[PDB]
Amino acid sequence: YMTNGIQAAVVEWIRALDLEIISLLLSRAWPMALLATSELRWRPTVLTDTDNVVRLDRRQRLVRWDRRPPNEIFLDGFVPIVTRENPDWEETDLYGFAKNNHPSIFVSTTKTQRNYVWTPRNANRGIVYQYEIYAPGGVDVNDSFSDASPWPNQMQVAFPGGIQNIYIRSARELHNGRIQRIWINPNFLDPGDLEPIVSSSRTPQVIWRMNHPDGGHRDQR
Ligand SMILES: NC(=O)c1ccc[n+]([C@@H]2O[C@H](COP(=O)([O-])OP(=O)(O)OC[C@H]3O[C@@H](n4cnc5c(N)ncnc54)[C@H](O)[C@@H]3O)[C@@H](O)[C@H]2O)c1
C-alpha cells in the first residue's frame, strides 16, 4: 500500500527522515509477543472510512480535543510534547503512547464516526476545543495492534512529529460542554470536495486572525 506517512509533521527532523526509520522508532520498543502478532500500519492514501465510503486520507474527518485555544493552535499547528532530535526510546514508542500517553513525539487524533466521535472524560468541564483535522498520512493505531490495541474505542490516528496548521480546518469552542463559537482557519489548505462545517444557525462562525480578542479563552493553569 501507498502512504503519505509523516507529511503532516511540523517537527523538521521527523519530516526529513525516511519511512523505514520512523517505523523503526515507533516499533523497536514493542514486546516480542506484540511484534509476533502486530505490524506497524500507516494510514493508506486510499482508505475505507467509518461509513464504509472509500476516501482519500486527506478527506477523512479527524478531530482533536485540546484545551489550548486557536491563537496558539491555528498559529503553530499541533506541536508534540517531545520535539528534540535525540529523544529517548520511551518518547518514540507507539505502544506506550497508545497505552499510557506519556510525553512523546506523537499528536493524538480520533476518527469521526460517520453514522459522533469519541469524547474524553472531562470534555464537558471547563473550556475545551474540538479541532477539525484534514491531514495526510498518520499511523492507524487499531489497524497496527488489532485486538492488542489498549483503547480501541478511541479510534486513534497518531501523527509522529505533529500536525501542520494548514491541515486544521476549524475548531468548536465549548464552555462546560456547550458550544460558543466555530473558528474558521484562514490558512487551511482546502483539498476540495469536503462537506460543509457542522453547524447550527445559533452558533456564530468566526474567521480567525492572529491575536483575535475572543481567540485565547482557556482554563487557568
Ligand atoms: N486529543 C484527542 O482528541 C484524543 C484523541 C484520541 C485519543 N485520546 C486519548 O485521550 C487521552 C488524553 O490524551 P490527550 O491527547 O488529551 O493528552 P495530551 O498530553 O496530548 O494533552 C493534554 C493537554 O496537554 C496540553 N498540551 C498538549 N500538547 C502540548 C504541547 N505540545 N505543549 C504544551 N501543552 C500541550 C494541552 O492543554 C492538552 O489539552 C489519551 O488516552 C489519548 O490516547 C485523545
Closest residue CA from atom 10 of ligand 1: 120
CA of residue 108 to ligand 1 center, whole Å: 7
Q: Amino acid identity, residue 23?
A: S
- Report d(CA 48, CA 65) in Å as an integer: 23
Domain that holds residue 26: 1-221
Tell me the sheet residues that pair with 40: none
Contact 48, 201 (CB under 8 A): no
- Burial label, 112 (beta-carbon count in 10 A; 0-12, 13-18, 19+): buried
217 alpha-carbon distance from chain centroid:
21
SS3 98: helix
Instruction: Indicate the resolution in Å.
Output: 1.9
H-helix or E-strand spanning residue 92: helix 89-92
Contact 111, 60 (CB under 8 A): yes
- CA angle, residues 143, 85, 111, in degrees to nearest 5: 25
Q: Amino acid identity, residue 141?
A: V
Looking only at the bridges linking them, the beta strands covering 178-184 and 205-207 are parallel
Q: To test the ligand 1 pocket, which listed residue (61, 64, 65, 121) has its Cβ within 8 A of the most ligand atoms?
A: 65
Q: Torsion-angle region of residue 179: left (phi > 0), alpha (psi -120 to 50) or beta?
A: beta
Q: CATH number for the domain including 47?
A: 3.90.210.10
Contact 183, 70 (CB under 8 A): yes
Question: By what technique were these coordinates determined?
Answer: X-ray
SS3 192: coil
When divided into structural domains, the chain yields a total of 1
- Report d(CA 80, CA 10) in Å as an integer: 9
Between the CA of residue 88 and those of 13, 23, 80, 128, 139, what are the distances in Å?
15, 15, 14, 30, 20
Residue 171: name the closest of 101, 31, 66 by CA: 66
Contact 181, 202 (CB under 8 A): no
Q: To test the ligand 1 pocket, which listed residue (65, 95, 108) has its Cβ within 8 A of the most ligand atoms?
A: 108
Tell me the sheet residues that pair with 84: none
Contact 119, 153 (CB under 8 A): no
Closest residue CA from atom 34 of ligand 1: 81
CA-based R_g, the chain, Å: 17
Contact 105, 82 (CB under 8 A): yes
- Report d(CA 35, CA 37) in Å as an integer: 6
